[PDB]
Write an enzyme that holds these catalytic residues in place. Structure first.
Site, short mmCIF file in Angstrom:
data_model
loop_
_atom_site.label_atom_id
_atom_site.label_comp_id
_atom_site.label_asym_id
_atom_site.label_seq_id
_atom_site.Cartn_x
_atom_site.Cartn_y
_atom_site.Cartn_z
N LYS A 38 -1.96 5.41 11.27
CA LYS A 38 -0.93 5.40 10.23
C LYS A 38 0.36 5.97 10.81
CE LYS A 38 -3.64 5.24 6.01
NZ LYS A 38 -3.62 5.73 4.58
C1 LIG Z 1 14.06 4.93 2.96
C2 LIG Z 1 12.59 4.98 3.23
C3 LIG Z 1 12.22 5.53 4.58
C4 LIG Z 1 11.68 4.58 2.33
C5 LIG Z 1 10.19 4.61 2.55
C6 LIG Z 1 9.47 4.05 1.35
C7 LIG Z 1 7.97 4.01 1.42
C8 LIG Z 1 7.30 5.03 0.54
C9 LIG Z 1 7.29 3.15 2.21
C10 LIG Z 1 5.79 3.09 2.30
C11 LIG Z 1 5.31 2.33 3.56
C12 LIG Z 1 3.81 2.32 3.79
C13 LIG Z 1 3.42 1.86 5.18
C14 LIG Z 1 2.90 2.68 2.84
C15 LIG Z 1 1.40 2.67 3.06
O1 LIG Z 1 0.91 3.98 3.37
P1 LIG Z 1 -0.49 4.42 2.74
O2 LIG Z 1 -1.59 3.45 2.98
O3 LIG Z 1 -0.78 5.79 3.35
O4 LIG Z 1 -0.25 4.66 1.18
P2 LIG Z 1 -0.87 3.93 -0.09
O5 LIG Z 1 -2.36 4.02 -0.14
O6 LIG Z 1 -0.19 4.63 -1.29
O7 LIG Z 1 -0.37 2.47 -0.02
#
Ligand SMILES: CC(C)=CCC/C(C)=C/CC/C(C)=C/COP(=O)(O)OP(=O)(O)O
Ligand SMILES: N#Cc1ccc(Cn2cncc2CN2CCN(c3cccc(Cl)c3)C(=O)C2)cc1
Ligand SMILES: OC[C@H]1O[C@@](CO)(O[C@H]2O[C@H](CO)[C@@H](O)[C@H](O)[C@H]2O)[C@@H](O)[C@@H]1O
Ligand SMILES: [Zn+2]
Lengths: 410, 315
Positions: free
Chosen positions: B110
């Site tokens: 990640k």
């Molecule tokens: C300006 C700026 C830098 C904005 C960023 C916005 C943002 C929150 C993007 C998320 C990108 C991402 C790869 C999420 C998955 O992580 P995960 O699998 O750990 O989370 P999840 O289970 O909630 O999808």
């Protein structure tokens, strides 16, 4: 109605139990994880109810303030993983203090300005720390932090001529932007570029040529926006995409109907908070990334003269989101978090508070309608839905920079 | 050589082979903010990285140093960039580097930098032969890793590796039918190969999805995919679908089914359907049911839909 000392909660209604997950007797890793979270959340909800007595919820301002104040000067080596994101720490902390209406002492403000100056690259933009190459993420953070400070000292630190050249150095012919030289491209870059460029008045006619179309290609079958064309819709990338389009005045490039239905579906019926993508878990930071899309959609639809828009509420459950944040996302020691069981961090403190503020305040035209759940002191300062810094800070910064010419351009 | 945790690890300030270069301390200013109290090992590596970066030293020693800097903070994009500059200058064996990035991603999947580095290596080598298998392993540990899926889409599209992806999608849907990342991949594969204009393909997809919905009626991903593959042509263009869902309603009145009916009614009204007043009444009744009973978390949205319907079709 109720005595002022008891305030009924949506999450505590008897019918709320009906909102628990129905796994259809077919268990998979997804349902198992969702059920585990709901089980914990129910326990938390129950701890705030004493039969018919439901004491008002309280945002632990002073504890959050002390945690933030300490973080602004020093951090443990547990933060070595964020050594390439220091301007983010400045932004997350300053914005949280700003939401909490805690003034920034002049000394601290000056020190922050000096530090951000050290992070600024001679090629333009800001890096994650002194001497690091510039990158759009910390550039976005540094600019927002400087705007939160809002002094001429802070504004003047930005080398606008080099910042514009730097943006050009990242612009791709298909309309996208690299996050940094020799770096990856995703919707975050477009938002970072559009945010800093509009705030500092360095937008040229060609800078964003093709960007609106590239962002629209990122909207997928779900209605939300993925990191790049073809990818799964995610609140983080959807916020970036829509906010960028709002700055470019090109929201209409998207199917707003499918986007609206997608984001509203991301609010968890049981938890009250938002998940980042379908079939994943609730998380306090999405209180901003997801819920923040509603004020943006409202503005967009209103511009098109939508006669059915509300004149008092955002199109999400404002009360339920406040319940999830206040009851499940506060660390008793100060700071906010993802969900019960997780540890506090500045990123979640920033976004949980940003989302709480959006959930508390509705404004459209001359219409203003507040819904502050709990004790009156819970009311936070408003935040601008595009930039995520105070609306006053946005106006002041844009006014200041509009007085300067676009670098080498007429 | 020696890893940061190895018992024989020596700090750079104590290495004879580094004695000729002066470390460059970080300039945080006289009154620092967000100051990280770094471990001695962390600061030591970074003081020397700053020195080689400043001198733009393209050496084997600088190359090995980046490996330590990366272990200390794999999100430091400046280090990764410099490492790539060295890979080229020193003409390092890229297959050896692929083995390195494989191990790194396994430990920290990640992270944006590690995946980007891998993509650059594959682009440089024009060799995607290890990609689908490596990604499948990462997804085997976290079936929804966003970076893994994104990298997978890039490889498949860039090197035209479409042949076995639908089977891969089918296997993962069998493992977890609620995996939204897999339904997204399903759309990615079909839209890019046969497309959905082929009525035989669309029918196969609608049947498959309806089957999944019957198996797990409350799985939102299947419902979203069903709408996703039919929405562009218009939900009202599929008259049999309405009937099928209507039959299922009494025994399966989930908010997903009810919401889908409203979506169908919306489109019908938009397309000069017969029995306008009747369809409008049905749609408004459903919006009320959703707002008040079946999907109250979205009451503001359903009330808005009710008002929209009236602003557009009351006549
Ligand atoms: C300006 C700026 C830098 C904005 C960023 C916005 C943002 C929150 C993007 C998320 C990108 C991402 C790869 C999420 C998955 O992580 P995960 O699998 O750990 O989370 P999840 O289970 O909630 O999808
Ligand atoms: N970017 C990003 C990103 C990636 C993944 C997530 C998913 N997510 C949701 N809750 C926690 C997370 C994981 N985040 C914390 C913030 N962050 C980060 C670092 C520096 C700056 C910024 Cl804004 C964020 C990360 O890289 C990883 C959230 C955000
Ligand atoms: O949400 C669907 C909506 O998004 C657009 C882009 O703005 O197209 C996306 O979704 C389609 C499936 O409905 C895909 O074929 C397309 O590739 C994806 O960008 C709109 O055309 C559509 O109405
Ligand atoms: Zn989070």
């Amino acid at each position: 109605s109720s005595p002022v000392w008891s305030e009924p909660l949506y999450s505590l209604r008897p019918e709320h139990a009906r909102e628990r997950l129905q796994d259809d007797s077919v268990e998979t890793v997804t349902s198992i994880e969702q059920a585990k979270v709901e089980e914990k959340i129910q326990e938390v909800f129950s701890s705030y109810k004493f039969n018919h007595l439901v004491p008002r919820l309280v945002l632990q301002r002073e504890k959050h303030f002390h945690y933030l104040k300490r973080g602004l000067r020093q951090l443990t080596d547990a933060y070595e993983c964020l050594d390439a994101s220091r301007p983010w720490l400045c932004y997350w902390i300053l914005h949280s203090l700003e939401l909490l209406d805690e003034p920034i002492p002049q000394i601290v403000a000056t020190d922050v300005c000096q530090f951000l100056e050290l992070c600024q690259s001679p090629e333009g933009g800001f890096g994650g720390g002194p001497g690091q190459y510039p990158h759009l993420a910390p550039t976005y953070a540094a600019v927002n932090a400087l705007c939160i400070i809002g002094t001429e000292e802070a504004y003047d630190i930005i080398n606008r001529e080099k910042l514009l050249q730097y943006l050009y150095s990242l612009k791709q012919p298909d309309g996208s932007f690299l996050m940094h030289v020799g770096g990856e491209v995703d919707v975050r870059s477009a938002y970072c570029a559009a945010s800093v460029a509009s705030l500092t008045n360095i937008i040229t006619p060609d800078l964003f040529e093709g960007t609106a179309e590239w962002i629209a290609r990122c909207q997928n079958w779900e209605g939300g926006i993925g990191g790049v064309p073809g990818m799964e819709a995610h609140g983080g990338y959807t916020f970036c995409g829509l906010a960028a389009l709002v700055i470019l005045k090109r929201e209409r490039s998207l199917n707003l109907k499918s986007l609206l239905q997608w984001v509203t579906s991301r609010q968890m019926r049981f938890e009250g908070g938002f998940q980042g993508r379908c079939n994943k878990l609730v998380d306090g930071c999405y209180s901003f990334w997801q819920a923040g899309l509603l004020p943006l959609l409202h503005r967009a639809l209103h511009a098109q003269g939508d006669p059915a828009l509300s004149m008092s509420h955002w199109m999400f459950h404002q009360q339920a989101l406040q319940e999830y944040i206040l009851m499940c996302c506060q660390c008793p020691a100060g700071g906010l978090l993802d969900k019960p069981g997780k540890s506090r961090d500045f990123y979640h403190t920033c976004y949980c508070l940003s989302g709480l503020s959006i959930a508390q305040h509705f404004g459209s035209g001359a219409m203003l309608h507040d819904v502050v759940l709990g004790v009156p002191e819970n009311a936070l300062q408003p935040t601008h839905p595009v930039y995520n810094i105070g609306p006053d800070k946005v106006i002041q910064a844009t006014t200041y920079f509009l007085q300067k010419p676009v670098p080498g351009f007429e | 050589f020696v890893s940061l945790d190895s018992p024989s690890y020596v700090l750079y300030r104590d290495r004879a082979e580094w004695a000729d270069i002066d470390p460059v301390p970080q300039n945080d200013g006289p009154n620092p903010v967000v100051q990280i109290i770094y471990s001695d090992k962390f600061r030591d590596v970074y003081d020397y990285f700053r020195a080689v970066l400043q001198r733009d030293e393209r050496s084997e020693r600088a190359f090995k140093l980046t490996r330590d800097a990366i272990e200390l903070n794999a999100a430091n994009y400046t280090v990764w960039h410099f490492r790539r500059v060295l890979l080229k200058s020193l003409q390092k064996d890229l297959h050896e580097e692929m083995n390195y990035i494989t191990a790194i991603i396994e430990e920290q999947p990640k992270n944006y930098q590690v995946w980007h580095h891998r993509r650059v290596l594959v682009e440089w080598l024009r060799d995607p032969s290890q990609e689908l298998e490596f990604i499948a392993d990462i997804l085997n540990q976290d079936a929804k890793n966003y970076h893994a899926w994104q990298h997978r889409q890039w490889v498949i599209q860039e090197f035209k590796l479409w042949d076995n992806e639908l089977q891969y999608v089918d296997q993962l849907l069998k493992e977890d039918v609620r995996n939204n990342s897999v339904w997204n991949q399903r759309y990615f594969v079909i839209s890019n190969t046969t497309g959905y204009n082929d009525r035989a393909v669309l029918e196969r997809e609608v049947q498959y999805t309806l089957e999944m919905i019957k198996l797990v009626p409350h799985n939102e991903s299947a419902w979203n995919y069903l709408k996703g593959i039919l929405q562009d042509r218009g939900l009202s263009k599929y008259p049999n679908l309405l009937n099928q869902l209507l039959d299922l309603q009494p025994s399966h009145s989930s908010p997903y089914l009810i919401a889908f009916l409203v979506d169908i009614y919306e489109d019908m009204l938009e397309n000069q359907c017969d029995n306008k007043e009747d369809i409008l009444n049905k749609a408004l009744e459903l919006c009320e049911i959703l707002a008040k009973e079946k999907d109250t978390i979205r009451k503001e949205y359903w009330r808005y839909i009710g008002r929209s319907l009236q602003s557009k079709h009351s006549t």
